[PDB]
Design a protein around this nucleic acid. Structure first.
Lengths: 275, 46
RNA sequence: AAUUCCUUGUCGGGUAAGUUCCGACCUGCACGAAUGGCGUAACGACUUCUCAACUGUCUCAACCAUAGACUCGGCGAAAU
RNA sequence: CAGUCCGCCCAGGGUGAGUCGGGACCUAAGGCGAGGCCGACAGGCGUAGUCGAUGGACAACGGGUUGAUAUUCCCGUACCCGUGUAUGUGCGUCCAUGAUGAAUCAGCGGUACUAACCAUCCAAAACCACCGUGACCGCACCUUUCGGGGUGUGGCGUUGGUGGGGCUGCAUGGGACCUUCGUUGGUAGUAGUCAAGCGAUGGGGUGACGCAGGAAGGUAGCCGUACCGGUCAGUGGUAAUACCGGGGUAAGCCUGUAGGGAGUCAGAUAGGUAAAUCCGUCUGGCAUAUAUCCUGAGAGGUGAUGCAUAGCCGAGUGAGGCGAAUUCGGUGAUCCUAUGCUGCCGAGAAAAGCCUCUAGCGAGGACAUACACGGCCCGUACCCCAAACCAACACAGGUGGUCAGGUAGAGAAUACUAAGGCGUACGAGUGAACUAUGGUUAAGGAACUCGGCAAAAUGCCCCCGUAACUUCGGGAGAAGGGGGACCCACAUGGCGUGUAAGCCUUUACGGCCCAAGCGUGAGUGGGUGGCACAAACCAGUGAGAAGCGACUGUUUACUAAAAACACAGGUCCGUGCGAAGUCGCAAGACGAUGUAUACGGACUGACGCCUGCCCGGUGCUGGAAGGUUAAGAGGACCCG
RNA sequence: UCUACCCAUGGCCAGGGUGAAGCGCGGGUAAGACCGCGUGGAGGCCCGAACCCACUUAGGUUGAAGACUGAGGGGAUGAG
């Protein structure tokens, strides 16, 4: 689902662009948009806290329904599939049978005119959202919750999908996209099927203009800074720091998760980093 | 030939930055106003 | 060799004459694989050599016109 | 410099708004912030709110006047909000009349509970089999020539983890009994509600938004002309055939053309925090509509018996009076239709305003005509690529936006000019050396020099012809060659436009055709002039071979623009979510309205072939047997 | 109020070239692959003024100017 540009300019030698082959409209739903203004990475004091961000194309936020609890037993029909800027997976519009209209993230394989249900009594098909307690064991899932009733948080990028290993007591074991085996309460809801637009990771962004469009200022390495700017800078000729690589603030390169926190009693095995 | 000097007058910004409604807003500004009033100046604030 | 102290290393191109340049040898004072190794069409107010055309850059200087320079009237400084 | 002059000095005068730019109207980024949370004090963030144009909505165009203002004053014709009186039409309550109601009396199976009933998921206690050894025992090893460790031969703590039956119990989902509407059979479709009109701060729609690209229809502008008023500019020719000047007029109000867009009607219903006749959704009938509706440049009519002008009289301070013709074509916008149409990915503000819904108020109220009235506060002079602003100066610097005539020309470049504006504030002389800036040069042509630094040179249009190499796009304007003037003929040609025009007619602001008229290149053949036909100004030098960097870009304002920084592309490390990382003592915030195909950090730097050996040193990661070692607990003994 | 970076809302870029995706026709292919011809108008594309810069040289160096002037020069639909 990618188009490769012809080498008609050095900025388009090997560049590629998503085919947009699944979209069905080029405009949003006027009633489900909100303003957005970018900050550049500057917090309530005005100081840069996160660097290398800013000066990008304007965009608008399309309200998304991740807390799918109200419409329970009411069917819906997919009316369109669309492209939204601030998200890696396509958006899909649903007309309920009551007369409500609202968005969700589009699972792989969804298509227009297709009907989706919900609730504990729902079929195991993509788009159907029903509690983790009513989903058999071994089925791919996406957009699951952490606390009961607390919106969907895990596995909602483009192409990623957790797997449901099984249930044990009042908990369910999940294999995350990264490889962790976590445990989540069984009252938590979840949608079926993996997220769509799974080819979008295969895109060469061509020139530097495209990254500046998406909005990110350039990044300057450490070794080319002065000794006062970075624990690496300095040295006549080309150096290597000679300092056991460290962050710009002096923090070494080790393990950063806080030890012994409340949630370490639900994690069965953390991801594997070797090789 | 970029001979752009350092003073570009704009009295809106002048009054907004060095103004009285701004000097009387923080502790230091009130101190400055009282100090000038004590020295005897004719122009307490911009 | 943007890296070679010995060094103008040795052979061959190019000039009537080539410590610079190109192709090779290799005895690497003190090259070398993401402080990346070797190549590569296009691009460069980047560094280095050669050719065609062009000329006062030169053999070797000459003449014309304006602004100062010089003379008359007015106002009239400066570093030391 | 001088000065009778002056942006200097003195006195008096001068700025006229319902429609122009602001406030009384609205919000964006940001600012303040009632309560509030956080912090020893000082204070930090922030909710409801309230401010904040560089944006949204909103009613006026021509001419004249003074020494100083004009969309402000005056003339002519308009538009927008309010108020009072009078008139005509007029729909309503009071009543009176239409539509309409709603519950008792026995009356559902589902909301879905008690107890239970069914299905599914889950794991308690005991009971079956296997790795694994924290131990540990003997035994075989490379052994230390066996006297030591650690590995397989098999038993112990199943210390950890596997599999099938078993299982006491949870829980989710259905049916099951708890009142919500039952099918209405009398009581009770009159009696409660609705029928004028205004209608919300509440619901809904619109407001409402990107970059790029033409083709088409117009207009402003400019160039010719019918027609009108005038000149003889002492020269060889020219009295009308020649030459010069005119060849004008707005908003609004009518009409709806080119272009663009759109289906309409019936049923029922919690979704819109309460109700909706409004919006969405579902099910049906109607033709997929030249039709019908919405928007709309322009032409045309009116505004206009007015206004203004070329000229003629007066007077010459410059007042004052009269006033002709005003048709037809050609070329043509960077401006209007256009907040349009067509493509593309990087997915392109909010609120007021306007329309519509009910909730609600209601005995008065809706429409049209005539007359008389109110329309508030601030700016309005004067300079404004400049001697009036930032530069110490009447300083060769800097300063955002709107107009955009003629000839050549592709052009908003270049040369000369039209309207308009200036000669800008020290002069007059004079062939000295020498310095700056322009101009020309015999023969030679880089011989100069650190180096072709500076200068010289090629320079446009139309036809031909174009190499090594390559990522197949490029290299390429490669290199190299020929023509360019003015007259005559082909030419009443060819092309564009289109009038009297013929044609049809959807009688319309129809469309096809096309004498005349106006405008325009390119080709061919024959001549003529010069030293020269791109004639002035404007206007690529080209080719071969090395090093570095892939490429466009960024950098030491003021001696360094590069081989340095960035880049698209790689690999490693961290991060399971008010995450890791950062600002802060803390609340809190950016990361992100994101979720491992995501975010932060480190090194290398397109593309092609590849990244060989070492974990001993220093780090980072994972662990256990032992030794080590702080506070706290411990209080034998000794002393006063 | 100069300069570095970011946020909200507006404005500007004469003239001339080249010819990507797609689409229509043909050729060709069992079929694709691709090749000629029309339509189309993309690109940190090409030549070049306004605008933004600052590579060379001469002048200035008690300057016209406490960093400028004359000639040449780079970018000019974009990381402007």
């Amino acid at each position: 689902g990618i188009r490769k540009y012809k080498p008609t300019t050095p900025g388009r030698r090997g560049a590629s662009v998503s085919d947009f082959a699944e979209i069905t409209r080029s405009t949003p739903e006027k009633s489900l948009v909100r303003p957005l203004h970018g900050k550049g990475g500057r917090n309530a004091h005005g100081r840069i806290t996160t660097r290398h961000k800013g000066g990008g194309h304007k965009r608008a936020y399309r309200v998304i329904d991740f807390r799918r609890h109200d419409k329970d037993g009411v069917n819906a029909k997919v009316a369109h599939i669309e492209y939204d800027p601030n998200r890696t997976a396509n958006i899909a519009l649903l007309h309920y049978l009551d007369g409500e209209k609202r968005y969700i993230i589009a699972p792989q394989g969804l298509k227009q005119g297709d009907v989706i249900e919900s609730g504990a009594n729902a079929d195991i098909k993509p788009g159907n959202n029903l509690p983790l307690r009513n989903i058999p064991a071994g089925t791919v899932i996406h957009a699951v919750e952490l606390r009961p009733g607390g919106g969907a948080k895990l596995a909602r990028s483009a192409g990623v999908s957790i797997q449901l290993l099984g249930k044990e007591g009042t908990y369910a074991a999940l294999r995350m996209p990264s490889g962790e085996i976590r445990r989540v309460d069984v009252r938590c809801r979840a949608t079926v099927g993996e997220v769509g637009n799974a080819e979008q990771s295969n895109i060469n962004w061509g020139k530097a203009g495209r990254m500046r469009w998406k909005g990110k200022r350039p990044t300057v390495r450490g070794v080319v800074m002065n000794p006062v700017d970075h624990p690496h800078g300095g040295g006549e000729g080309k150096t290597s720091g000679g300092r056991h690589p460290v962050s710009p603030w002096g923090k070494p390169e080790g393990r950063t998760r806080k030890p012994n926190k409340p949630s370490d009693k639900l994690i069965v095995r953390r991801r594997r980093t070797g090789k | 030939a970029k001979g752009k000097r350092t003073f570009q007058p704009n009295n809106r910004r002048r009054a907004r930055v060095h103004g009285f409604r701004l000097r009387m807003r923080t502790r230091a500004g009130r101190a400055i106003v009282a100090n000038r009033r004590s020295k005897g100046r004719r122009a307490l604030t911009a």
